[PDB]
Design a protein around this ligand. Structure first.
Ligand SMILES: [Cl-]
Ligand code: NA
Ligand code: NA
Length: 129
């Protein structure tokens, strides 16, 4: 599924991401835009052999099992294919673990390079929340 901007903001709010670990809702919408262009089916292969999956591009070396990343962990205890669903529950639950790991939202390279330090409230302007 390809989400609309305000559609995704509402779903993320219903799943408890607004102000989770102190990150306002616009941060999460900004990260999704630049990681996946709001597309739940997005995949990207990395140089080290792992693959990133889903709307928040969660990586197979640490967080999910895809059967082809040797010597990796599965810290969210899910198959990576669960992260491509139109329902974002699995992506939201795993993202909550990642942002609690110590480095906050800096774990998402696109957030650090394109969202951090900007006016992220603009990503939820005009939405009925
Ligand atoms: Cl933080
Ligand atoms: Na990316
Ligand atoms: Na893995």
């Amino acid at each position: 599924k390809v989400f609309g901007r305000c559609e995704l903001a509402a779903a993320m709010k219903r799943h408890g991401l607004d102000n989770y670990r102190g990150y306002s809702l616009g941060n999460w919408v900004c990260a999704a835009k630049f990681e996946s262009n709001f597309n739940t089916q997005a995949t990207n292969r990395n140089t080290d052999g792992s693959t990133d999956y889903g709307i928040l591009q969660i990586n197979s070396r640490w967080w999910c099992n895809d059967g082809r990343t040797p010597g990796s962990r599965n810290l969210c205890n899910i198959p990576c294919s669960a992260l491509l669903s139109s329902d974002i529950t699995a992506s939201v639950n795993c993202a909550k673990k990642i942002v609690s790991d110590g480095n906050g939202m800096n774990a998402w390279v696109a957030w650090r390079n394109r969202c951090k330090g900007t006016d992220v409230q603009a990503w939820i302007r005009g939405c009925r929340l």
